[PDB]
Structure 1
C-alpha cells in the first residue's frame, strides 16, 4: 500500500491514506455515498495492511455507526467488501453490507 495516497470509490467517497507504518494504516475517510448519512464529514480511518490483503475501519460518530472494509490491492484498484454496524434509533444494533472498489487518484 502506497502512503500517502488518495483513493475514491464508485460512490464518490474519498479515502486518504496518510501512512502505513509497521503495516498499520492511518488515514481519513469522507462519505459521499448516496443513500447514507454523514456526507462530507472527514473521519479518521484505521486498519492493517499485509502482503495478503488489507482491512480498515471508519467510525461515523455523528451517525452512531462504523464500517469495516476488507479487501486487497491490485495496483491502482482496491476491491473490497464492507459491513456497516449501526445502533438504530431504538438502540438496536443492526448491520448492512455491500461492496466498494476504490481507485487510486494520487
Structure 2
C-alpha cells in the first residue's frame, strides 16, 4: 500500500491515503456515488492492510451510517467488496452490499 496515494472508484468517490506505516491505514474518503448520501463531504478513512489484503471503514457521521470496504491491491487497482450500514427514516437499521474497484490516480 503506497502512501500518500489517491484512488478513485468507478462512481467517482475518492480515497486519499496519508499513511500505512505499520499496517494501519489513515486516509480521507469522500463519497460522490450517485444515490448515496453525504456526497462531497470528506471523512476520515481508517483500517488495516496486511498479507491477507486490506480493509477500511468510513463513517459518514450526519447521515448516520458507515461502510466497510475489504479487498486487495493489484498494481494500480484495488478491487473491493463493501457493506454499508445505516438507519432508514422510520428508524430501521438497514444494510446494503456491493463491489468497488478503486484505481490509483497518482
TM-score after normalising by structure 1: 0.97
* Cα deviation code 1:39-95 (max 9, x no counterpart): 100000000000220000000002110000000100100000000000122222110
Q: Distance in 2 between matches of 1:91 and 1:20?
A: 36
Structure 1 consecutive aligned stretches of length 4 or more whose deviation exceeds 2 Å: none
- Match of 1:83, SS state, is strand
- Match of 2:78, SS state, is strand
Q: Which residue of 2 aligns with 1:98?
A: 98
Offset, 1:18:
0.4
Report the number of matched residues. Answer: 106
Greater CA deviation, 86-95 or 27-36? 86-95
Map 1:64-83 onto structure 2 (within 5 A): 64-83=64-83
Offset, 1:25:
0.5
Q: Which runs of 5+ in 1 are unaligned?
A: none
Q: Which runs of 5+ in 2 are unaligned?
A: none
User: Relative to total residues, which structure has the larger helix share, 1 or 2?
Assistant: 1
* Cα deviation code 1:16-50 (max 9, x no counterpart): 00000210010000000011111100000000000
